[PDB]
Design a protein around this ligand. Sequence first.
Ligand code: HEM
Ligand code: HEM
Ligand SMILES: CCCCCCCCCCCCO[C@@H]1O[C@H](CO)[C@@H](O[C@H]2O[C@H](CO)[C@@H](O)[C@H](O)[C@H]2O)[C@H](O)[C@H]1O
Ligand SMILES: CCCCCCCCCCCCO[C@@H]1O[C@H](CO)[C@@H](O[C@H]2O[C@H](CO)[C@@H](O)[C@H](O)[C@H]2O)[C@H](O)[C@H]1O
Lengths: 402, 55, 273, 124, 124, 438, 61
Amino acid sequence: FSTAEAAGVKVAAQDGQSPISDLSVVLRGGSRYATVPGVSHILEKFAFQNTVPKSALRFVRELELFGGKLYTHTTREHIVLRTQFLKQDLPYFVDAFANVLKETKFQQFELTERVAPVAELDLLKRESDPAFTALEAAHEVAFRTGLGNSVYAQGYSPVTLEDVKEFARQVYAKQNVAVVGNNVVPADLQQLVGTAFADLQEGSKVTQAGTTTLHGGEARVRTSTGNALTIALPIAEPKPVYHALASFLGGPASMPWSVGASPLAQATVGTHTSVKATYHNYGDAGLFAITIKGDSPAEISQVAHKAVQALKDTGAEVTEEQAARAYAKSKFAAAEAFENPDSSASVIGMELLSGVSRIAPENVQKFTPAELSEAAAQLSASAKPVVAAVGQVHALPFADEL
Amino acid sequence: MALRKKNSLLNMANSYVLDSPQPSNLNYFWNFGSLLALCLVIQLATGITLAMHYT
Amino acid sequence: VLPWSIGVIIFLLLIITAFMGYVLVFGQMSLWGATVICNLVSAIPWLGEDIVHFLWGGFSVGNPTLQRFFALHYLMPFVLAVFALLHLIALHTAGSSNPLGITSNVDKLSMHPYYSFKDLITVFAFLLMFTLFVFFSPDKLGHPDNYIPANPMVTPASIVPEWYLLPFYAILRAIPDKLGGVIAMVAAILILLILPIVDRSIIRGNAFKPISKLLFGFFICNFLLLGVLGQVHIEPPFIVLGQICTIFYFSYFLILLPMVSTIENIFFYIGSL
Amino acid sequence: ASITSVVKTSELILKSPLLSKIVVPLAKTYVKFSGYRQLGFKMNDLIIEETPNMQLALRRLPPTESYDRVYRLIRATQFSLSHKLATGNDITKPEEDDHYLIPYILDVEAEAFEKDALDNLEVV
Amino acid sequence: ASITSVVKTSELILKSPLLSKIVVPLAKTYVKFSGYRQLGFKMNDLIIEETPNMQLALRRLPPTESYDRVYRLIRATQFSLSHKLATGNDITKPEEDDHYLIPYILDVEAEAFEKDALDNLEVV
Amino acid sequence: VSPKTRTSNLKNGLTIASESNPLVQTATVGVWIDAGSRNENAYNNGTAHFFEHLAFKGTDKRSQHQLELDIENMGGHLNAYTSRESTVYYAKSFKDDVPKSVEILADILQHSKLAESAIDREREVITRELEEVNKQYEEVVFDHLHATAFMNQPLGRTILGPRENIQTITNTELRKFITENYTADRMVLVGAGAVDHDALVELAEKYFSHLPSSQSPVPLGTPIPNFVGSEVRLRDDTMPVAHIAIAVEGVSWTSEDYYTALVAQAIIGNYDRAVGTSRHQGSRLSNIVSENNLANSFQSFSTSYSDTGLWGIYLTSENTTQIDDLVHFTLKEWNRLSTSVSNLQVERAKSQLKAGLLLSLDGTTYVAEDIGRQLTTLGRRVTPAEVEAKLEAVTEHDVRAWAQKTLYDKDIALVGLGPIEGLYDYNRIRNDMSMMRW
Amino acid sequence: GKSTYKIPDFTPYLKKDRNTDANRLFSYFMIGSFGMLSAAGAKATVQDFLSNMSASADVLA
Ligand code: HEM
Ligand code: HEM
Ligand SMILES: CCCCCCCCCCCCO[C@@H]1O[C@H](CO)[C@@H](O[C@H]2O[C@H](CO)[C@@H](O)[C@H](O)[C@H]2O)[C@H](O)[C@H]1O
Ligand SMILES: CCCCCCCCCCCCO[C@@H]1O[C@H](CO)[C@@H](O[C@H]2O[C@H](CO)[C@@H](O)[C@H](O)[C@H]2O)[C@H](O)[C@H]1O
């Protein structure tokens, strides 16, 4: 991805040999910057609504004539708007993004009839998985605001058209926008972005209201629709070793009809439960989480004890074999993330919008057993453990039990 | 929505002769109602015609 | 649109019902009116003469025609009652319109007791008019010739329909061609079916439309003049006047109402800016 | 006729200096003789509403505009049944006769007409 | 007649040795000739249900009994329209002909009849 | 323009097919087999699915645990699936972990233990799978759809097989199945992503050279199905959403009408209320359904097999009093493929498909799946230029002629699950397959 | 008796040539014949019946 600048907008593109191009606008407008709760989700859903040059209807009908597709999502850090189309149709897609950023008519009827109902279905579909809920609850306990803001719009706190219009005035500005083109000729994209995004406001860098503060605690989301438990440990100094540790501890199987050879995978034997360790770097803080879902609260409780033990055991001693297995699983995870268009866009988006250079999968550091055990030791001896229980919460563990 | 259901006049006919939900096991003795309707239509047609010629 | 369209058919059935009932007396106007009105069917190309003989049940209006008119005159009011019920059921989906032309969904009253008691006033006003004709002047609306028994030999001085059919008769006389005249006469009723299309107004009804109100006034008075011209003799200058009134009748639907309703739309918009 | 049609034709007239010079005074007199203001209506309260497009435009009115329209319809209905006219502040003054509904119906119709056009596109 | 009446009279008969000796054998043949078991029905499936009391009793059936009753009605309807009889395990055996509904309807009616009595009480 | 798919053979008749992408760092290698449940009879139905479980249960060298560790150490993962006509076993890895992954796949396919103890253990796991598919409503619907459309025929059988067979599957019949079916002339070794073709051919010569050849080598993708118009109703009033599939007999992979059927399917298209753009789609059915809230979703499909196919639509709806309208409007849109479609709809669908068929292939696994599927169904990978030409050859006359012989007034197979009281009987549904006005 | 994927036996009823044009055409020949006799019967009925309104024998005499 050759990083450049076109009329004040950061543009990164990588040419390829495929008939299919992916163009993504990455906006510094994720939930950690959300002025009011849910606004970044609403702004994402307001993309490709009516603009002054082109109605939402006309856009969708023309997109079907190109056979293009449209993908949008919100993270804690970004809003990502992606289009996938044939290489030759690049100018149309550049101009479409320009119309969205410069000329979106934010109309109240679109909010009530189109945008908010779709936002609500989006969230309900995600929450069908209790593990999603548990990991969201864990971020809320751990960070409170900023990273602790909800990613998604919720019913209890309504977003108004004035909220969304204000946020869009901040976000849709040259300072918060990066263009990422997969299988796009980089010289051609710079020329097109330079003509199309020239009249976009310059604006200012959107910032997180307040510094990231870490907290421990418990969240007990009582649902009737499945059971899950996250054990998170907030990290004040994000370090790349936690990727290796997440992959080492593992949890999912690498093979059909198997349990797996990972410590967390072996913690589920004799139970219909699954487990997944994840590490979330957010630049200035991080979160190391272990999420366990299952149908039995008794089994979840059982696995949760084994999970905390596994982390303590790791803090004691890692073998050389295990450390190499962690390097291999981690390099692989990095590679597939840089391939997947959704995650790819945000990775280069971070490099362009902040200045955090991407770590290429081939350059993923090999951590010695000493370095891994040290990282696990810090987590087992955390002052601020978070536990989010979802489901039959009366039957799930508490932080002080773990 | 289908016109037969949407339009109030059509929907009245629909409710009696088309979508009308019937038991699946009516035997042939449930056919006398339609024969009575047939007799009534024959009597109206023949009766009005005889009225054109009768004094 | 649907209650109005079924309404137009109710009006046609009332005309047929009343025409057949008038023949039943079998006085001079009964016979000669049946003869001339039934001979209009002879204009239907190719089969017209055959259809007339078939309707009469013979070669002129006679006993077979009278007996069949009795049977049909008895039947037609029952058919008319069914169509009257159909147009009410069709109306029930929107409810009654009202004189302001706006929705009444904001402010409804039960039919009873309010409109029950308001209907009694006009029932008694109607019964007073009924009483004055039926008891004090029972033959004012009739033709003396219908007290002479039908005589196929002697033709009455003037053969005219009952007063309520007179405007349609004037329209028919206006066209010199037989078939032309019959088409025009039928079209004068069926053209009511196009009002939903030719009225281009964004507003329902005339309460707030001064130009439409003037046009409506002229249309109604022209309809009454056509009625009068239906019973004058075919003489100057009434021949030409009947043709001008016929043109005005049709031009209301085809030209004037579409033009006036278009212009009034623009005056409401510009006038209230 | 569509509101779109009425609005476009009116704009053609308002552009032409000659045309506006002769049409605008007539339209103002027409409105005065129409007399809907004497029942406390605004012009847009009279537009036929029993149509999918108009029902959608009315649903998009802001709540305040919607509640006030309901009151003007009820008040006009009460003047109509009483055979009275508005007096005083119930009479709509010319400056209060605002086109509150026109922008909503023009947006509803814009989409409706674009949908009709696009249903008839032919790939070239 | 009410189920309560039928049940009480039946109990009077079953008490009397003489009466039961002559009535019970008759009732068993009656049921055999009735032939509802040959369509896979249980006796209680035949009771008229279009009454408030019976609709309430049916709503109080346990879900499994309710689902099985639905199946027996559908199955019997299919035998009826085909002009066939049950065979094999579809025939209701005498030991399967259980009064699953009688306790529910007797409770519904007990309350209904107590309510009628108490609506007519006279303070003494 | 995507890189050329290279293809080589070994002596036994194993095909190697590869498509390199020097921009990615991962690779998907695997074995596509032209064999699946359809190759079983009634007695061993379920064997192919049973084998897929045992393939990961230990080989002559590596035990179950060693297998787990070996893959964990590789860093990527292994995956498998068995369908009615196709079995796949693949490994996603790093660029330089490809020789490990080929070696593990070759081991689990050729040298699996199928130990009586493991057969007995899985026999319970698979028995539990019978009572948990019940939740995956789309799969329940499509399995009943095949069962009824191809009543009492091999395509009509499920992949899991009956409970009775699961209890009686022996290591003998497992071994017999994979010896008869997993032959070199029915197998394709596929690599996509960061793979060298010449490297992959060497690895094939090293690991898959001692594969049996079949006695009578037919070409890849070689097969008579007799469709039954019929219905399965699985009414469940406690479910909130109705799931309905309606299908007619469709087209095989090698039909001359294969592209015509895809274009017709694209004219009806898909719809999902949860996606923002779906209210603005061009499809007539989409407009009717969205305006009237008739459904949560619908998905048109055109499934192909070697000698038949099913073409139809899958609907989901909460609108339980308007299921009749939903079905009525859907079948009236099908009628219009016979009576009304013109160059307007046809050219629009062709535009959308020309991109769609390329867009689908957006990762190494999708590319590998495309090479593997095409090689095992057609015997070759069809270049995008050829695909563009075949799509361009579809005219409106072709669509109307196809719909008139395939849809118009034809029997349907219909499956309804959930609150489907409002779904009318077979005749009233099948009467919507024609229009009396035409 | 338990599996819903095992379709009940329909072999006593199923026709082997059920998907053929000849199969459909036969059933439409029955429907068509019925429609044809109903058309011919309606025509005869209407013509004979309505002829009552044409001049009776005593009128033609
Ligand atoms: C339920 C409907 C009807 C029934 C049961 C019925 C019954 C009868 C009967 C029993 C007769 C004596 C027939 C004879 O022996 O000659 C008769 C005669 C007659 N009916 Fe009806 N009728 C009915 C409807 C009508 C209608 C609607 C008319 C319309 C006028 C009508 C007109 C006549 C006439 C004119 C005669 C005398 C001529 C004759 O005997 O045939 N009938 N009717
Ligand atoms: C037997 C003759 C008729 C009867 C008994 C009849 C009766 C009625 C009644 C009771 C109503 C509701 C109350 C009212 O508005 O006055 C009504 C409404 C109506 N009628 Fe008629 N009607 C007849 C003929 C006609 C004709 C000939 C037409 C049209 C040409 C017609 C068109 C309508 C319409 C459009 C309405 C709805 C008017 C509205 O409320 O805005 N009717 N009719
Ligand atoms: C028999 C000849 C055919 C002509 C029809 C007979 C005329 C009698 C019709 C007028 C009586 C009113 O008839 C009444 O109409 C409504 C809708 O039409 C029916 O209503 C029924 O169907 C509609 C949809 O089909 C549903 O909204 C409703 O839930 C259901 O109850 C009533 O069950 C019926 O009693
Ligand atoms: C909307 C429908 C269209 C209009 C309906 C037409 C109404 C009248 C049509 C013809 C009626 C008379 O037409 C005539 O019918 C009678 C049968 O009834 C036929 O007469 C034939 O059969 C009758 C008895 O069945 C014999 O007595 C006669 O000798 C023989 O010729 C004539 O051959 C035919 O010329």
